[PDB]
Amino acid sequence: SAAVESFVTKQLDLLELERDAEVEERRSWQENISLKELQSRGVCLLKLQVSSQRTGLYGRLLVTFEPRRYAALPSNSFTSGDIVGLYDAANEGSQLATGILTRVTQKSVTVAFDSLDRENSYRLLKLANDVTYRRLKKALIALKKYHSGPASSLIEVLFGRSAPSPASEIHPLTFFNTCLDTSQKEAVLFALSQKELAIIHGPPGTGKTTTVVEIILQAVKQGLKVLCCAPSNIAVDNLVERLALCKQRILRLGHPARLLESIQQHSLDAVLARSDSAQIVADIRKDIDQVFVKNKKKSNFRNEIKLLRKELKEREEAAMLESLTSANVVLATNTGASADGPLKLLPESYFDVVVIDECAQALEASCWIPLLKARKCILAGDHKQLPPTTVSHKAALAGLSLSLMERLAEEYGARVVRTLTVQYRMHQAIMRWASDTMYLGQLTAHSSVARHLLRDLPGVAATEETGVPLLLVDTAGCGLFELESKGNPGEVRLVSLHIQALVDAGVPARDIAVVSPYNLQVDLLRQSLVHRHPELEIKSVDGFQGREKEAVILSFVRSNRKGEVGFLAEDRRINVAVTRARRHVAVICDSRTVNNHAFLKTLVEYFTQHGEVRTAFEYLDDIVP
Numbered sequence: 001s002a003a004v005e006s007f008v009t010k011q012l013d014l015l016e017l018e019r020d021a022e023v024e025e026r027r028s029w030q031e032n033i034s035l036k037e038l039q040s041r042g043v044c045l046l047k048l049q050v051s052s053q054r055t056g057l058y059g060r061l062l063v064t065f066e067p068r069r070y071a072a073l074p075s076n077s078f079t080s081g082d083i084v085g086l087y088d089a090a091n092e093g094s095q096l097a098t099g100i101l102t103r104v105t106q107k108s109v110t111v112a113f114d115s116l117d118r119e120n121s122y123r124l125l126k127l128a129n130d131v132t133y134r135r136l137k138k139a140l141i142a143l144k145k146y147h148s149g150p151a152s153s154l155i156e157v158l159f160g161r162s163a164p165s166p167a168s169e170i171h172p173l174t175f176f177n178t179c180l181d182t183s184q185k186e187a188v189l190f191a192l193s194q195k196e197l198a199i200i201h202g203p204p205g206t207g208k209t210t211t212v213v214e215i216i217l218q219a220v221k222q223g224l225k226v227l228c229c230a231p232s233n234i235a236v237d238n239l240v241e242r243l244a245l246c247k248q249r250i251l252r253l254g255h256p257a258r259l260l261e262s263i264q265q266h267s268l269d270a271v272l273a274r275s276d277s278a279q280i281v282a283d284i285r286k287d288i289d290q291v292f293v294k295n296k297k298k299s300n301f302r303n304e305i306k307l308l309r310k311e312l313k314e315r316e317e318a319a320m321l322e323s324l325t326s327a328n329v330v331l332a333t334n335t336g337a338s339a340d341g342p343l344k345l346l347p348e349s350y351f352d353v354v355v356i357d358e359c360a361q362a363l364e365a366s367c368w369i370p371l372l373k374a375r376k377c378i379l380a381g382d383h384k385q386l387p388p389t390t391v392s393h394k395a396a397l398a399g400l401s402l403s404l405m406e407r408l409a410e411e412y413g414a415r416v417v418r419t420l421t422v423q424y425r426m427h428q429a430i431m432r433w434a435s436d437t438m439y440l441g442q443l444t445a446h447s448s449v450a451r452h453l454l455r456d457l458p459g460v461a462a463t464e465e466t467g468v469p470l471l472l473v474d475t476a477g478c479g480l481f482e483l484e485s486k487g488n489p490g491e492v493r494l495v496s497l498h499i500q501a502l503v504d505a506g507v508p509a510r511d512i513a514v515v516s517p518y519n520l521q522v523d524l525l526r527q528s529l530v531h532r533h534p535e536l537e538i539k540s541v542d543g544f545q546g547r548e549k550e551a552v553i554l555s556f557v558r559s560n561r562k563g564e565v566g567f568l569a570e571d572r573r574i575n576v577a578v579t580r581a582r583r584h585v586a587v588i589c590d591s592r593t594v595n596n597h598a599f600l601k602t603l604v605e606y607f608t609q610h611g612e613v614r615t616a617f618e619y620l621d622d623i624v625p
Contacts (some may be wrong), residue, residue: 022390031488049118058316081336085097187418219245428445437602553586555589565593
């Protein structure tokens with residue numbers, strides 16, 4: 001109650017810092033930045049046209065927006081759950097309303113609300129997510145004001161006040177998944193045995209989610225109820241897909257970010273909509289069928305929806321509690337799992353185990369939403385990769401960067417953590433660098449990826465580039481300096497030349513990824529490359545978490561006189577960056593600058609030991625020393 005009080009007040013502060021930081025952050029973008037290229041960044045959509053408007057789940061009015069009669073949407077970072085602002089072109093730039101994405105396709109976008117004409121011209125503006133802030137702030141007060149309950153023991157252990165209780169005796173397991181390596185079989189067994197806290201640690205390519213799934217299947221098999229969460233939609237949807245293939249009884253507190261049919265089937269609205277209610281849409285219709293007769297001009301109408309509203313509620317809450325009550329696993333992003341959301345309906349002490357996947361990517365405040373809905377939690381992910389992102393760096397340092405899983409791991413180590421060790425992605429030479437610098441040399445390469453090269457690929461010819469798994473082309477000391485975020489047009493030309501090398505040898509662009517730490521380098525690189533290789537992904541490290549290509553090319557950007565790298569000195573980002581690659585990783589960088597940081601120095605020292613190393617002088621002829 002003390003360690004709790006302080007942690008909490010500390011957090012509540014770190015938040016308004018963030019919230020204030022994010023808010024002002026957006027004000028500037030909305031200020032000194034045109035509507036036209038805000039969209040260019042994928043953070044506003046225009047100009048849009050109403051395609052449909054139907055009252056949906058809860059009283060909420062679901063409006064669907066598509067590009068005016070042209071037709072797919074301009075690429076964007078809109079995702080289910082986002083907060084969105086609605087404007088009219090012919091209106092006074094005044095904000096008409098605020099909403100929530102429920103479904104974002106390549107050529108449509110759906111917002112829930114709580115007038116609108118089928119003839120344009122609407123705008124859509126990504127805004128701070130005040131709901132998340134409001135929820136986080138509350139699971140935080142709810143924690144500090146926690147009583148005597150199932151969650152009691154977990155909390156002691158979590159806050160050091162007590163210690164991981166002795167692990168129940170291991171009652172032999174039959175594995176649903178038959179192809180599990182020994183490393184995973186033990187993580188599973190261990191995890192079921194804890195009666196408090198378990199953490200499974202999954203380095204790049206080791207099959208974490210596969211092991212999270214087995215663990216979940218085993219807990220359903222013991223007849224336990226599981227609330228399973230992650231910080232991202234995408235993490236949640238991958239679990240949904242997996243569990244679904246394993247014919248499990250699940251319910252995702254929607255909505256999905258991935259559009260796969262398999263996954264759309266299992267979200268709340270499509271669970272309810274699968275009987276036994278054709279009635280509840282006859283309430284929806286009934287009132288969205290009267291906002292029709294709304295335009296007569298007018299009140300006393302209000303009392304009539306007030307009525308249909310309260311009936312929809314009572315009916316919806318019932319079919320909900322049912323669908324909830326009969327699933328063995330309820331799935332939600334950490335936020336979705338909130339105490340106001342659908343879960344309010346369940347009787348406390350309903351769930352036994354909370355599972356949180358990609359915990360190392362989630363900020364601890366978010367984890368305390370589901371975490372106190374059960375007596376036992378199971379954390380999974382890799383705290384040696386990217387931590388939760390923030391806007392207020394000064395807040396991050398303050399401890400917002402510190403996820404639940406990471407602290408508990410450094411804290412408890414093997415009293416609680418099991419780490420997977422066999423990886424199925426990288427050539428041994430790529431693995432070995434990450435193994436040793438990040439994962440204590442414990443990683444091992446499954447025989448199906450160890451040894452694999454680009455020349456092994458169908459249609460790919462054998463080349464000085466295709467037959468090597470490691471390549472460094474070094475910019476020291478070729479006057480290929482950075483700019484004045486950061487950019488480096490010298491590097492941009494080297495990576496295009498080496499892209500051309502691979503593509504010309506037969507490697508399809510769709511198998512390659514260009515990646516850079518810096519947003520402006522990405523921008524610089526898209527500019528020079530997209531028309532040349534339309535299928536080639538070009539992203540920042542942070543926009544490539546969890547991804548994987550046969551070949552990855554990296555651009556370090558930092559090359560200067562004062563020998564500075566910066567944020568480039570976040571090793572986990574480099575770790576993530578090197579580990580996306582399967583058969584081939586090329587690094588374009590300035591030795592002379594990069595070496596002034598130890599982690600980076602040993603990275604390039606590695607490439608020098610193993611794999612090939614070239615100088616820019618071999619690529620560029622107009623180069624002046």
